């Protein structure tokens, strides 16, 4: 409709006076109207970094694509928009940030859906994993403060119920899911802000990813790339040492050159 055409353009181009006016007086408007690519007002405002429009839309209840807008904002590193979205009762009241990608794929609430069918990113990619993938240090910190963690993908030869039934079901989603989890674990954004000893964590993770490169021959390049990310993180931390005490901490751990 003309009201929805006008409303979508106002949100997309940051026409705050029009966006605010329509959300107040209009009683015949569907905030969930989509454009030619199936993007509603929230997804258009987040994509163009319209924080003022984003907060006006989120005040309107029955607004859709809340979960996808957070992932879209995290992907673009819009820190101010992220904390505006993370202040939506879909995230604040619930525990969506804390739950694992597996637990997320058991809810089946289509919260992070960007359209009738599908998600913008892989369903296994949680907000914390996406923030780690994009290496958004401030977004990772914000999600870590909320309790978000990356679950380790288990061993390749894991005979637990979850790893057995996921490999039996698809064996390709499971293979791609563990790469995404390790791609977030191996990010310097998550390595530095999660563990008390990132240098020890990166060294151990570098070995773990190197071994998986041989086991998963077809995704060998993916795992070798992630191993190098942990390899040059500890080199990066060593490069920042400025006196002997800092060097002796990185090299000896907590003079045995451990």
């Amino acid at each position: 409709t003309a009201e929805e055409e006008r409303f979508l353009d106002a949100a997309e181009y940051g026409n705050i006076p029009v966006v605010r006016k329509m959300l107040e007086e209009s009683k015949t408007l569907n905030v969930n109207c989509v454009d030619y690519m199936g993007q509603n007002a929230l997804q258009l405002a987040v994509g163009n970094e319209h924080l003022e429009v984003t907060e006006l839309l989120l005040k309107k209840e029955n607004l859709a694509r809340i979960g996808d807008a957070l992932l879209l904002a995290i992907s673009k590193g819009y820190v101010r928009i992220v904390e505006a979205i993370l202040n939506h009762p879909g995230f604040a009241a619930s525990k969506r940030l804390t739950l694992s990608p597996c637990e997320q794929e058991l809810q089946d609430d289509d919260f992070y859906a960007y359209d009738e069918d599908g998600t913008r990113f892989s369903p296994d990619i949680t907000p914390i994993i996406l923030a780690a993938h994009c290496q958004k240090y401030e977004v990772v910190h914000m999600l870590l403060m909320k309790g978000a963690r990356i679950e380790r993908p288990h061993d390749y030869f894991c005979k637990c119920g979850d790893c057995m039934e996921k490999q039996r079901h698809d064996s390709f989603s499971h293979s791609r899911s563990r790469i995404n989890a390790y791609k977030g674990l191996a990010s310097p954004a998550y390595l530095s802000l999660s563990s008390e000893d990132p240098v020890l964590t990166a060294l151990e993770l570098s070995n773990e990813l190197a071994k998986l490169a041989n086991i998963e021959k077809e995704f060998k390049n993916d795992y070798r790339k992630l191993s190098m990310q942990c390899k040059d993180f500890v080199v990066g931390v060593l490069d920042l040492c400025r006196d002997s005490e800092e060097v002796e901490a990185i090299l000896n751990g907590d003079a045995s050159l451990s």
Partner: nanobody
Framework: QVQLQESGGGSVQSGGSLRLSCAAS??????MGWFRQAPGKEREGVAA????????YADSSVTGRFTISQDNAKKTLYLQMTSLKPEDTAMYYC????????????????????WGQGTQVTVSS
């Protein structure tokens, strides 16, 4: 200057059906539309149709119950009104313009240069 004259208006009971006609005299009327003006308020859009037939309807209250159409070749604009409501009582104008632009899909009265006299529609419940 295109000449627009409205016809078909009158008094109908609620839930009834009406059909408004707009006779156009001139060639530069590639964009036409219907606008209503309830008493005590401002003139607002109802529908708008291009020459190729692309239509947009103002709001979602009139969508599905109001239909705009044009003989195009015969230079006539029609507004099929069904399921009339008491709030639909207003003065209905047909407007024409040679060009609108990116603001055409908003059905805004200020984008139309030529206007008819308007016909009064009074829906009684």
């Amino acid at each position: 200057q295109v000449q627009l004259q409205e016809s078909g208006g009158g008094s109908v009971q609620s839930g009834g059906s009406l059909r408004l006609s707009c006779a156009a005299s001139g060639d530069k009327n590639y964009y036409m539309g219907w606008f209503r003006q309830a008493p005590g308020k401002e003139r607002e859009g109802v529908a708008a149709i291009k020459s190729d037939g692309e239509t947009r309807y103002a709001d979602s209250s009139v969508t599905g119950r109001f239909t705009i159409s044009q003989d195009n070749a015969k230079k006539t604009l029609y507004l099929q009104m069904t399921s009339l409501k008491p709030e639909d009582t207003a003065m209905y104008y047909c407007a024409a313009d040679r060009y609108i632009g990116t603001r055409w899909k908003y059905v805004r009265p200020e984008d139309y240069s030529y206007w008819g006299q308007g016909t009064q529609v009074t829906v009684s419940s």
